[PDB]
């Protein structure tokens, strides 16, 4: 029994206030996306419960994507945000 | 030498895969030793099909060589019935009974003379060969281990009863690749009805990609491309031991083509070829997959669901779309697909497949192509189910909606959720 932040696509300086109870084996993940849009450049963060995540940093069509993993309640927050 | 038998039995080797240099002569135990048959290893018997020339086709050395690559300690016996295979088709077809009886007599002999176990024998029959292998399996003293049917012949077998063709009873496990089923039943080159424990239909079985206009060893490749493909799929399986191709059970090929049948629950999927799981289902199977035109062959399957949203209420028809997948390992850009119609506040599911090993999905771009006004929808999320990794992925727009506008900039979505099954 672990609780993770579960927030689809939040702006950089928004904190997440939705959480889920993950199931047998699951860990906390966070996907950060930084790149350009029609309306200016944008850092977004997405959070959820996952089975085996691998962290990555990859650049994919000009927008930088980073995935992070962790195994404690409410640990999946963007690297510039606090618990 | 109550052993008159017309068929010949060559034991080829990893270093001599082309010629029939050493023969196992039934009724002559000393021949087995001459030829260095390995009593401690499994045995493949390769049974060719019909041949308008008197000769082996060029696939025979390839299959032998692949089997020895995958199984370097095994015994690969090539059965020669070239003489009977050179007749007019209905004659050669009739001779499948005698070639089968010859092969069963030979196997039964190896069992009586050497206590060689029949559960160490895998028969691989191509075309007419598949039925010769079926009949042989039905006449062995104990049941043989595996029969593999590579596009079993259709004419005079489609409406034949089990004793006279390949059927599931003929071995402990029977797996069949159907690759050239185009035609009306009984007039297809390859048999239409499932005759195995597991029957796989690459590209729905009727015709194979890469077989229309080509560069084409063999007397006339262009005509028998789709038929012969069954063998090259098996070969490709022998060479990709730790990287097989899934095939997915499905109610129909039409259903498969909509992406309704990915899913690997309760043997709803299996591996094509050598690495197959020997399920022996309660009745039939019938499984589907897509493939490439040239070798490696393996492809990755995804289902895509898109809900097209808007306040305004239009329909469009035979609309064309490009979708681009970006993953941790690679990307494949500009995959085409079309939709019968695209109407507001409706959801459409569909199959995407790609030769490219993407890795885990990260970003997904959608382009609405103008047709060979001013219309567009708002899309918030796209759902994707991946067949090979049994994962459901959700992408959502970086902003609150991605506007999809026909003939303009592609809508961009990034992964916001993952799930396994
Ligand atoms: C017949 O095939 C066997 C191998 O059979 C295969 O593996 C078995 C374990 C079973 O699962 C079979 O069903 C399967 O098909 C051949 O055995 C090979 O030969 C010898 C020992 O028999 C091994 O060679 C080496 O010898 C040197 C000494 O100079 C040592 O340094 C090595 O440690 C090793 O012992 C070889 O590993 C072995 N291979 C395997 C896979 O066990 C056998 O050669 C063959 N018979 C004939 C007549 O060719
Ligand atoms: C597609 O389905 C959705 C329903 O889920 C429809 O979206 C809805 O469109 C209505 C227009 O009737 C919108 O209503 C608006 O609400 C705002 C309040 O935020 C108000 O200020 C406006 O006066 C207006 O009434 C709304 O965006 C939206 N509502 C919901 C519940 O989703 C859409 O119209 C449907 N299209 C078709 C053709 O069926
Ligand atoms: C978000 O925060 C407020 C407290 O200020 C609370 O009322 C709300 O319940 C929180 N969200 C959830 C899902 O609990
Ligand atoms: Ca039979």
Task: Give B316-336 as a DSSP string.
Answer: EEEEEEEEEEEESS-EEEEEE
Instruction: Please list, in sequence order, all residues whose beta carbon lies within 8 angstroms of the beta carbon of residue B194, skipping any fewer than 6 positions away.
Output: B176, B284, B285, B286
CB atoms within 10 A of CB B281: 14
**Number of structural domains in chain A:** 1
Instruction: Please list, in sequence order, all residues whose beta carbon lies within 8 angstroms of the beta carbon of residue B315, skipping any fewer than 6 positions away.
Output: B341, B342, B343, B344
Question: How many residues make up chain B in this entry?
Answer: 421
Partner residue opposite B326 with nearest CB, options A8, A53, A61: A61
For ligand 3, atom 2: residue with the closest CA: A17
Q: A68 and chain B: CB distance < 8 Å anywhere?
A: no
Closest residue by Cα to residue A3 from A75, A69, A67? A75
C-alpha span between B74 and B71 (Å, rounded): 6
Q: A44 and chain B: CB distance < 8 Å anywhere?
A: yes
CB atoms within 10 A of CB B143: 15
Question: Is B162 annotated among the ligand-binding residues?
Answer: yes
Question: Is B165 annotated among the ligand-binding residues?
Answer: yes
Give rounded-to-5 percent helix, strand, coil for chain A. Answer: 0, 50, 50
Task: For strands A56-58 and B381-386, give the pairing.
Answer: unpaired
Instruction: Decide: helix, strand or coil at residue B3.
Output: coil
Considering every ligand atom, which ligand is closest to the CA of A3?
A: 3
- Cβ-defined contact of A37 to B417 (cutoff 8 Å): no
Q: How far apart are the first and last CA of chain B?
A: 59
CB atoms within 10 A of CB A52: 11
Q: C-alpha distances in angstroms, B132 versus B104, B111, B154?
A: 10, 19, 13
Q: How far apart are the first and last CA of chain A?
A: 19
Closest residue by Cα to residue B388 from B366, B360, B418? B360
Tokens of A26: 């699951």
B40 close to ligand 1 (CB < 6 Angstrom): yes
Tokens of B91: 């004659």
C-alpha span between B194 and B389 (Å, rounded): 28
Chain breaks in chain B (C to N over 2.5 A) after: 216, 372
C-alpha span between B10 and B20 (Å, rounded): 5
Could you tell me if A44 and A33 are in contact, meaning their C-beta atoms sit under 8 angstroms apart? yes
Cite the residue boundaries of each domain of chain B with CATH code 3.40.50.1820. 8-300
In angstroms, what separates the C-alpha of A32 from chain B's closest C-alpha?
10
Could you tell me if A69 and A28 are in contact, meaning their C-beta atoms sit under 8 angstroms apart? yes
Tokens of A13: 């300086």
Instruction: Please list, in sequence order, all residues whose beta carbon lies within 8 angstroms of the beta carbon of residue B52, skipping any fewer than 6 positions away.
Output: B86, B219
Could you tell me if B185 and B215 are in contact, meaning their C-beta atoms sit under 8 angstroms apart? no
Closest residue by Cα to residue B394 from B379, B404, B381? B381
Could you tell me if B281 and B270 are in contact, meaning their C-beta atoms sit under 8 angstroms apart? no
Considering every ligand atom, which ligand is closest to the CA of B343?
A: 2
How far is residue B52 CA from its own chain's centroid? Answer: 25
Catalytic residues of B: 127, 151, 227
Residue where the block lists tokens 């950089």: A12
Closest residue by Cα to residue B323 from B364, B295, B285? B364
Q: B3 and chain A: CB distance < 8 Å anywhere?
A: no
**What is the H or E stretch that residue B365 is in?**
strand B361-369
C-alpha span between A71 and A26 (Å, rounded): 8
Resolution (A): 2.8
Q: Is the dihedral of CA B358, B267, B203, B223 positive or negative?
A: positive
Buried-state track B329-353, b at ≥16 Cβ within 10 A, e below 16: eebbeebeeebeebebeeebebbbb
C-alpha span between B260 and B330 (Å, rounded): 26
B73 close to ligand 1 (CB < 6 Angstrom): yes
For ligand 1, atom 12: residue with the closest CA: B41
A18 close to ligand 3 (CB < 6 Angstrom): yes
Q: Is A62 left (phi over 0), alpha (psi -120 to 50) or beta?
A: left
Buried-state track A31-46, b at ≥16 Cβ within 10 A, e below 16: bbbbbeeeeeebbbbb
C-alpha span between B230 and B240 (Å, rounded): 16
Tokens of B421: 């099954």
Provide the CATH topology of domain B8-300. Rossmann fold (3.40.50)
Q: Which domain holds residue A39?
A: 1-83
C-alpha span between B288 and B258 (Å, rounded): 12
- Cβ-defined contact of B398 to A31 (cutoff 8 Å): no
Residue where the block lists tokens 């690749």: B177
B41 close to ligand 1 (CB < 6 Angstrom): yes
Cite the residue boundaries of each domain of chain B with CATH code 2.60.60.20. 301-420
Could you tell me if B179 and B208 are in contact, meaning their C-beta atoms sit under 8 angstroms apart? yes
C-alpha span between B206 and B191 (Å, rounded): 10
Provide the CATH topology of domain B301-420. Lipoxygenase-1 (2.60.60)
- Cβ-defined contact of A8 to B397 (cutoff 8 Å): no
Strands of A56-58's sheet, edge to edge? A7-11, A41-50, A27-36, A64-70, A56-58
Could you tell me if B209 and B233 are in contact, meaning their C-beta atoms sit under 8 angstroms apart? no
Question: Is B284 annotated among the ligand-binding residues?
Answer: no
In three-state form (DSSP H/G/I as H, E/B as E, the rest C), the secondary structure along B267-333 is HCEEECCCCCCCCCCCCCCCEEECCCCCCCCCCEEEEEEEEEECCCCCEEEEEEEEEEEEECCCEEE
Partner residue opposite B362 with nearest CB, options A8, A44, A65: A65
For ligand 3, atom 8: residue with the closest CA: A17
Instruction: Decide: helix, strand or coil at residue B88.
Output: coil
């Amino acid at each position: 029994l672990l609780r993770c932040y579960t927030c689809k696509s939040l702006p950089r300086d928004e904190r997440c206030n939705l959480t889920q109870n993950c199931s047998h084996g699951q860990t906390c993940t966070t996907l950060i996306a930084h790149g350009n849009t029609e309306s200016g450049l944008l850092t977004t963060h997405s959070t959820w419960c996952t089975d085996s995540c691998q962290p990555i940093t990859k650049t994919v069509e000009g927008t930088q994507v980073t995935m992070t993993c962790c195994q404690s309640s409410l640990c999946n927050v963007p690297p510039w945000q606090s618990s | 030498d109550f052993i008159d038998i017309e068929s010949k039995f060559a034991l080829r080797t990893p270093e001599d895969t082309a010629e029939d240099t050493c023969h196992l002569i039934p009724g002559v135990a000393e021949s087995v030793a001459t030829c260095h048959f390995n009593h401690s290893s499994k045995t493949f018997m390769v049974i060719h099909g019909w041949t308008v020339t008197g000769m082996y086709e060029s696939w025979v050395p390839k299959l032998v060589a692949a089997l020895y690559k995958r199984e370097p300690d095994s015994n690969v016996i090539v059965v020669d019935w070239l003489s009977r295979a050179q007749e007019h088709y209905p004659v050669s077809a009739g001779y499948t009974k005698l070639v089968g009886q010859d092969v069963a007599r030979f196997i039964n002999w190896m069992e009586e003379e050497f206590n060689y176990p029949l559960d160490n024998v895998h028969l691989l029959g191509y075309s007419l060969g598949a039925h010769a292998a079926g009949i042989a399996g039905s006449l062995t003293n104990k049941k043989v281990n595996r029969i593999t049917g590579l596009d079993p012949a259709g004419p005079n077998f489609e409406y034949a009863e089990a004793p006279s063709r390949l059927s599931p009873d003929d071995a402990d496990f029977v797996d069949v690749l159907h690759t050239f089923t185009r035609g009306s039943p009984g007039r297809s080159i390859g048999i239409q009805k499932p005759v195995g424990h597991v029957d796989i239909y690459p590209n729905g079985g009727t015709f194979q990609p890469g077989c229309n206009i080509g560069e084409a060893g063999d007397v006339d490749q262009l005509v028998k491309c789709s038929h012969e493909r069954s063998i090259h799929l098996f070969i490709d399986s022998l060479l990709n031991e730790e990287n097989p191709s899934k095939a997915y059970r499905c109610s129909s090929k039409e259903a498969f083509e909509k992406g309704l049948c990915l899913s690997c629950r309760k043997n709803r999927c299996n591996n094509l070829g050598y690495e197959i799981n020997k399920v022996r289902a309660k009745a039939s199977s019938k499984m589907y997959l897509k493939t490439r035109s040239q070798m490696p062959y393996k492809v990755f399957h995804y289902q895509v669901k898109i809900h097209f949203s808007g306040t305004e209420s239009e329909t469009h028809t035979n609309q064309a779309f490009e979708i681009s997948l970006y993953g941790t390992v690679a990307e494949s850009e500009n995959i085409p697909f079309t939709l019968p119609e695209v109407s507001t506040n409706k959801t459409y599911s569909f199959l995407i497949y790609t030769e490219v090993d993407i890795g885990e999905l990260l970003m997904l771009k959608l382009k609405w192509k103008s047709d060979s006004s001013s219309p567009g929808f708002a899309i918030q999320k796209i759902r994707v189910k991946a067949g090979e990794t049994q994962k459901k992925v959700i992408f959502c727009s970086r902003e609150k909606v991605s506007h999809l506008q026909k003939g303009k900039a592609p809508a961009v979505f990034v992964k916001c959720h993952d799930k396994s099954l």
